[PDB]
Amino acid sequence: PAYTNSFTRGVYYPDKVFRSSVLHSTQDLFLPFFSNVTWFHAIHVSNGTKRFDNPVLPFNDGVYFASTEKSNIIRGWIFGTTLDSKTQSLLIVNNATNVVIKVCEFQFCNDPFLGVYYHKNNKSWMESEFRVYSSANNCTFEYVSQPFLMDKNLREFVFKNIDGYFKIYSKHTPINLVRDLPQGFSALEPLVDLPIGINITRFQTLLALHRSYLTPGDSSSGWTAGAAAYYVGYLQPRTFLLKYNENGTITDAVDCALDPLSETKCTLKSFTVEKGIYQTSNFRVQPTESIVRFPNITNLCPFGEVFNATRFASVYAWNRKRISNCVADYSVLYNSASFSTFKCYGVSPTKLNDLCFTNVYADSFVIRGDEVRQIAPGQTGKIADYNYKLPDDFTGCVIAWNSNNLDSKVGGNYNYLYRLFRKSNLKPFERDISTEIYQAGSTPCNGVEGFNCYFPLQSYGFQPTNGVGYQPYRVVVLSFELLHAPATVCGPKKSTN
Amino acid sequence: EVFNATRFASVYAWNRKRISNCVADYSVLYNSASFSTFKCYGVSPTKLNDLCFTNVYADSFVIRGDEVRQIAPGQTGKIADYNYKLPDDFTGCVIAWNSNNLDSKVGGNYNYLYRLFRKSNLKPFERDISTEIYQAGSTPCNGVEGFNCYFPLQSYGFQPTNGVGYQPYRVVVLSFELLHAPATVCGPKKSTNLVKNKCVNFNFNGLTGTGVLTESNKKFLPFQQFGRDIADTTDAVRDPQ
């Protein structure tokens, strides 16, 4: 793709309002003056070898399509968001009889094209069949009129989508230029406005393919596609000072943003500006970034104390503490690598800082190392069922870390206990401080101990020699909830350098 | 068929249909007592006949009763912000009438949907039919419904026993725009003979001005209808007839 200058082209009629000797300046989607326009060349013969290349060029809020070919090789265009059956697709077809603009939900083929055949008696290339879409569903609009594409000649078309309307402006002027857009000014009258009502993201040119191409032969004997020369530009929202002559034709225009001189013309609303200094605009330096600074978190929630402490409650007597009315920093909690287990089932731990929850709870308890996995949302386990239960729908963090140094020693930690036997599985987030013997059995023993009656609580054995399976791994379950009340505990307000 | 149709679409995907190349008698609509609310924002209900409009759009959908107020230029709400948003500078008239006996049955009528959750605000006069699951923000979720993510379409609860504010109210939003393009559909005001060189009151497709008409040598291109001057007051008009 070789680029060429726009050279003050793409100027069309903004509104269907007559004006005579009026220097009316309006802002509209326009092709910027002196813009470097890509001369796409779709199919280039090698020997006559076919090289099919119809790229999906982006719409970019307007296309200044143009072609200098007098052979009328181009026949219609393709407009669509994704060019599939799901999305509504726009079709333009320019046959000899008329122009067909048809909009439906179209399942396009890999190569959308118009197939023509040569008839010996008629000696003309009539349309054999159309092969662009496989199916036509949810059809919305159709338009038929005299073909503008047919009848040296340079054909210009601006395609715009504004408020569900398709704007097409056509102008035809014969030129002798080989491959460059003329260094001249030509306004574009509104050919037709179409209430398509769909969004167009990419633009694809459609080319007529002859019977020689339609044959599976790699070489088209009767047709050559090397003349497929077309230009594609992109329109930008620039204010323009259009000049209407006595007939209402825009003989000339200036693009305000192109250079300070054109900004001067737009300011004075005159194409000829006398020598001097003119306050065209004001220079404003935009902010590079945003900085937010806020004081230290005075009411810092004591997560450091509760997480890092010497003495904790046991699992059966697990302590529930209310973390509220303070701002809590979970960034230090997440960044800390001291804890072996940092799992937040309800919410992603990474974004725990930004969210604000009305009420936060922390549970302190002690379980064996092998049974750390038992404390999990909707987990069936002895310790999980009996003393500490976690609900299926859980919004909180379960934090565990090695506690060999904190409390494990040669002396057994007989003070800590777990409920080996209980009548029923405990409800989630329920405290179980029970001294009941729980005799149960075939017959209640009614005593401290029995053959079938056992005291619920059994002493932990914590030893350094116990190893990974039996070392403490003291576990903390953090809890979150929302009670349809204003949040009083939340992450610290962000501070930037 | 715009108003007395058997079926009307839900708010999230409403029917926008063209009205053009006709004669429009808004008076028979206005005088009708079926329409409970006839608030015209950019126009007047009585004076709709005099005007002539380039394009007429009829947006029809079924909403709950209390939500009628929030379908208006510049009002916030559930329906207004996630389902159907009118522009702040809206020129048109909203027509609403009770439909409890029509589209609400003895059992729960649940075919009408409103998008309860959406990422952000709705732009004016745009239809979003996306059914992607909405994530609150705490945790990412897949397409399957989750604890934190919900299906965005929510069904209206319509029962005959519901009172005002909980009953379906058909709303037809007639949005009118004057783009200076040739007008297509407008009032039934009878055309009269054209008068030149004499001071007359002229109503050329709703300009409604007073002046003396003289034949002009200025040439108008076929697409464009009327000219303008510095004051942006009409300096030349092409006859409609």
């Epitope: 729908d393 919004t395 409800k427 989630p428 329920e430 929302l482 009670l483 | -």
Partner: antibody, heavy 122, light 110 residues
């Protein structure tokens, strides 16, 4: 497990006000929330009122607000409800109700209910 | 207040087959993510038995056959292996506000 005891059936004359309570076993009565409900066959269950046994306020539904007096006894783990101007339509089978919460301050779940006593005025 | 309309009321489903019942409240029972809905197993002349005491929480000691689904006003119950004796009247209840209304009733038969 948790067992709540109710009379099998109660036959009374119209216009009589009486106390109905549930004995609580297997759980601490004070901590858990105390609610009440009545059943009428062929008609939906509809709630009565709320009291927290240890230092808790009381609320009732609007239709039956103050129609029946409701109290809680810390001893015997029983909550006593008293009628007022009992009628045939007021008669229904009443169920002892216990409520539980993950964090408190809300009614997350109802864990156990009693068998219920049938207030038949036949 | 909040009214619950159980749909499709009484339902008949074959043994070991998908069964779906949904009750939609007049206004949503979920406050912020968490939902307050209770589904009950009331046999004739027997106390109601819990199935699902939250949006998706399932009571311990009860078969996992009952499943939780739904959001905001609309909550759906799924029973893929419907069993013989568990069929009875089903109630759904909203715990968000003080009216504390329950469902109408949902008869089930094989």
């Amino acid at each position: 497990q948790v067992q709540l005891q109710q009379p099998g059936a109660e036959l009374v004359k119209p216009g009589t006000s009486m106390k109905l309570s549930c004995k609580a076993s297997g759980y601490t009565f004070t901590s858990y929330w105390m609610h009440w409900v009545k059943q009428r066959p062929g008609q939906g269950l509809e709630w009565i009122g709320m009291i927290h046994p240890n230092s808790g306020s009381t609320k009732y539904n609007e239709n039956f607000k103050s129609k029946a007096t409701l109290t809680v006894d810390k001893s015997s783990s029983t909550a006593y409800m008293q009628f007022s101007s009992l009628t045939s339509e007021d008669s229904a089978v009443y169920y002892c109700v216990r409520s539980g919460s993950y964090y408190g301050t809300t009614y997350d779940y109802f864990d156990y209910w009693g068998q219920g006593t049938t207030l038949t005025v036949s | 207040d909040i009214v619950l309309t159980q749909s499709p009321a009484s339902l008949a489903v074959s043994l070991g087959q998908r069964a779906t019942i949904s009750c939609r409240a007049s206004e949503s029972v979920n406050i912020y993510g968490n939902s307050f809905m209770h589904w009950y197993q009331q046999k004739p002349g027997q106390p109601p038995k819990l199935l699902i005491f939250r949006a998706s929480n399932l009571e311990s000691g009860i078969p996992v056959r009952f499943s939780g689904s739904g959001s905001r006003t609309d909550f759906t119950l799924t029973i893929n292996p419907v069993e013989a004796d568990d069929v009875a009247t089903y109630y759904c209840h909203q715990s968000n506000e003080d009216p504390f209304t329950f469902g109408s009733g949902t008869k089930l038969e094989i």
